Amino acid sequence: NLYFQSMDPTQFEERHLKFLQQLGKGNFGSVEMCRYDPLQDNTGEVVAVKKLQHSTEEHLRDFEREIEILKSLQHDNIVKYKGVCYSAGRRNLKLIMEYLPYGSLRDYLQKHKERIDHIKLLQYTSQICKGMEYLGTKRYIHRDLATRNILVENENRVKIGDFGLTKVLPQDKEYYKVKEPGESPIFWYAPESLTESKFSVASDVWSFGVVLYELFTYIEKSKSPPAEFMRMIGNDKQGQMIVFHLIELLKNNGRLPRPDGCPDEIYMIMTECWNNNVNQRPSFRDLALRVDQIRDNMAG
Ligand SMILES: N#CCNC(=O)c1ccc(-c2ccnc(Nc3ccc(N4CCOCC4)cc3)n2)cc1
Structure with a gap:
């Protein structure tokens, strides 16, 4: 006062x-x-x-x-x-x-494919993981990790660019239970977020797996997570039926497909992020190291 x-x-x-x-x-x-x-x-x-x-x-x-x-x-x-x-x-x-001049990574991937190759995608992957390592040190849960919320400074630098859904973990818990939900980006959500409204570093890792999928689909028409999940669920489904089927699909190992041209090893990272067992998901530190080792092990 x-x-x-x-x-x-x-x-x-x-x-x-x-x-x-x-x-x-x-x-x-x-x-x-x-x-x-x-x-x-x-x-x-x-x-x-x-x-x-x-x-x-x-x-x-x-x-x-x-x-x-x-x-x-x-x-x-x-x-x-x-x-x-x-x-x-x-x-x-x-x-x-x-101000970051190239806009969202979602738009940049669609509008600037002329200057994107797998090396760049792995660089962006690494940078996103490092930003998320940093968030974890603050006990912040982003809750909306998606290429639309990553911004592009230049061809060599991306940054997590929005925090409107971010929550701070309680002191004594490793998850935040959201008890006032608004509009939810369901096609990026971990199963326990869909079924229990529980958000954690590990659910951010799940969403990061979807980001990695987005990167390698190059934001190709018909390949986005919503379009692909809707194709798997049934394109005619509407309303809560979508959520019911999404939950049931994910709980029994239904997953987004390997994007065309995506290396098996990068798809493996995606599928390890998409583990229904929360504690078995890798950490962002694990992921940054693995991605940077992949990059570094290339010739040159
Ligand atoms: N409300 C809400 C959710 N957050 C945003 O919409 C959001 C957040 C951050 C920014 C942001 C921050 C810093 N730089 C930029 N740069 C930016 C540059 C170009 C574009 N687009 C270029 C292509 O046409 C559409 C806009 C968008 C953002 N954006 C933009 C939107």
């Missing part, structure tokens, strides 16, 4: 934050490209600015937690927090982060 939490409301003043482009909309948020030009001279750093789509009270509280999460992270493969803009005369909140 007496003294409010430290914040720097003059770091990004709304009057100097200049719109450049709309970048995308999520479930609860919208992201713009802006230029922060305090010397009103048409210069300044380019930044990404996350805002809410629907500014209810509950969403604002969750957004504050997301901001605190991102601010606490400093790693080469995590999008860089810059600050907050308290716009509308300090009656609204916007999150300021660095």
Whole structure:
């Protein structure tokens, strides 16, 4: 009460934050490209600015937690927090982060295949694993690892780029039970997340396996996880029947197929991540080392 939490409301003043482009909309948020030009001279750093789509009270509280999460992270493969803009005369909140020019990895794989080969995919795989190792040191569970939430700085660097579903483990538990679910990315979820709403480092590893699948399908039309699972389940299914069949399929070892051209050894990594036995999934440290050894064992 007496003294409010430290914040720097003059770091990004709304009057100097200049719109450049709309970048995308999520479930609860919208992201713009802006230029922060305090010397009103048409210069300044380019930044990404996350805002809410629907500014209810509950969403604002969750957004504050997301901001605190991102601010606490400093790693080469995590999008860089810059600050907050308290716009509308300090009656609204916007999150300021660095701007990464090539957008989501999902889009980059579809739009920039000319500059992607397996070496690059393994580099991105490694970088994602290292960012996730770092999250684990903070006891953060991402809960939405997917190529749409990874951002591309350049052909040699990707970063985990969004944290809107991230949760902090309780002190005395190795899982977080989500007890207010909203929209769920079911085709990336581990079975125990689907059946018990339990999220953990190990369920992030499961989702990472799906990310690795996404990378090697090159975001090919008809090969995405939703399209492939729907083909396996039955394309005509609708509503909860989809979830029922997805759960039953996963529990009895149904899995996404090996992408065309994917090496057996990379598919093996995927299938080890997709273990119904939570404790048998590899760690992100195991995965980064294995991927970097594969890369390093190539000639050159
Ligand atoms: N709400 C919600 C879920 N999160 C986002 O939508 C989200 C989060 C972060 C960023 C972000 C952060 C830093 N840099 C960038 N760069 C970026 C560059 C290009 C594009 N696209 C280029 C192609 O057309 C569509 C936008 C998208 C983001 N994005 C974008 C969207």
